Design a protein around this ligand. Structure first.
Ligand SMILES: CN(C)C[C@H]1O[C@@H](n2cnc3c(N)ncnc32)[C@H](O)[C@@H]1O
Length: 325
């Protein structure tokens, strides 16, 4: 027994077993199915017209299969439309924000087979797992205009969702994620396959990326970090040991290089005095990113992210001013 959904662009149908699996307390395949249909209607207006003319109950196989079938018919229909004088949909675009949210949720669901195993890290160590919200990454994408000049790195990439979202959204020459712990790195290998497959299924283009197992403190990474123009690092749980080593790594970045983190690498109020010349604040502007409305962590205050920009002008100027009355 099965349910099937035709790709709007001709890829292999998506096949779901019956009964449909549950993912967590508010995610099951039934809603995935419904939502994928909902989203393809969003991408193809004609499909939506063809689809308007309908009830459905998530628990009934016939009721579900009548929906899958109704959608599969309409796809056949649209494909016939495209053989006519009508042009195909825009052939290879970036996904809308909404579609992207769904796609990554879909990818996660099919890959992170057991979400609870992602809590099996050593507590109060740099291994602590946390997931940056899609909206936040969205904000970063919006505020940090990136081009094909840029290279992107998520240090400690988890299962890799930041990389995937950024790769979906921007045109960086390449995007990297590096993660050290087995569990998330294992899952990342699946995330990668699934993301590639789902993007093909919806016919959406994405930039190039690689999810790697490794240590971002190793020798190899020193140089790699220096060539990176944009770095995302969710370091809230790193601790001063690891933060300090990262400061050294960052000291080597090119002008205009950018780092986005959850905990600043230099105080915000930083004036360069006589005693702090060696310090990382000397070479970078640091701003707080605007909080997203209605957003409160366990800290009661809004969750903050910080943007750092390599600006050695700051240093140049303090030296220049050491030659003035
Ligand atoms: C918060 N979470 C998403 C951070 C992830 O960072 C991982 N991590 C911590 N240290 C390193 C390291 N030295 N090299 C590569 N990854 C590391 C951590 O496993 C968590 O999944």
């Amino acid at each position: 027994l099965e349910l099937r959904l035709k790709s709007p662009v001709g890829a292999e149908p998506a096949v779901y077993p019956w009964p449909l699996p549950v993912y967590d307390k508010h995610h099951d395949a039934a809603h995935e199915i419904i939502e994928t249909i909902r989203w393809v209607c969003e991408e193809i207006p004609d499909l939506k017209l063809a689809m308007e003319n309908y009830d459905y109950d998530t628990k009934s196989f016939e009721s579900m299969q009548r929906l899958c079938d109704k959608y599969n018919r309409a796809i056949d229909s649209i494909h016939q439309l495209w053989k006519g004088t009508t042009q195909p949909m825009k052939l290879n675009t970036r996904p809308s924000t909404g579609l992207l949210r769904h796609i990554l949720q879909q990818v996660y669901n099919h890959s992170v087979t057991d979400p609870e195993k992602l809590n099996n890290y050593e507590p109060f160590s740099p291994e602590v797992y946390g997931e940056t919200s899609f909206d936040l990454v969205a904000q970063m994408i919006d505020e940090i205009k990136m081009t094909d000049d840029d290279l992107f790195v998520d240090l400690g990439s988890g299962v890799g969702q930041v990389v995937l979202q950024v790769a979906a959204a921007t045109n960086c020459k390449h995007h990297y994620g590096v993660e050290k712990a087995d569990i998330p790195a294992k899952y990342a290998e699946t995330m990668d396959r699934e993301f590639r497959k789902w993007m093909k299924w919806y016919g959406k283009k994405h930039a190039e990326y690689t999810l790697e197992r490794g240590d971002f403190l190793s020798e190899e990474w020193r140089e790699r970090i220096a060539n990176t123009s944009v770095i995302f690092v969710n370091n809230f749980a790193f601790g001063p040991e690891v933060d300090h080593q990262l400061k050294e790594r960052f000291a080597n970045m090119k002008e205009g290089g950018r780092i986005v983190s959850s905990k600043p690498f230099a105080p915000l109020n930083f004036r360069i005095n006589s005693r702090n010349l060696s310090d990382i604040g000397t070479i970078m502007r640091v701003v707080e990113l605007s909080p997203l409305k209605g957003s409160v962590s366990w800290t009661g205050k809004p969750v903050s992210y910080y943007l750092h920009t390599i600006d050695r002008t700051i240093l140049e100027n303090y030296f220049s001013s050491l030659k003035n009355p």
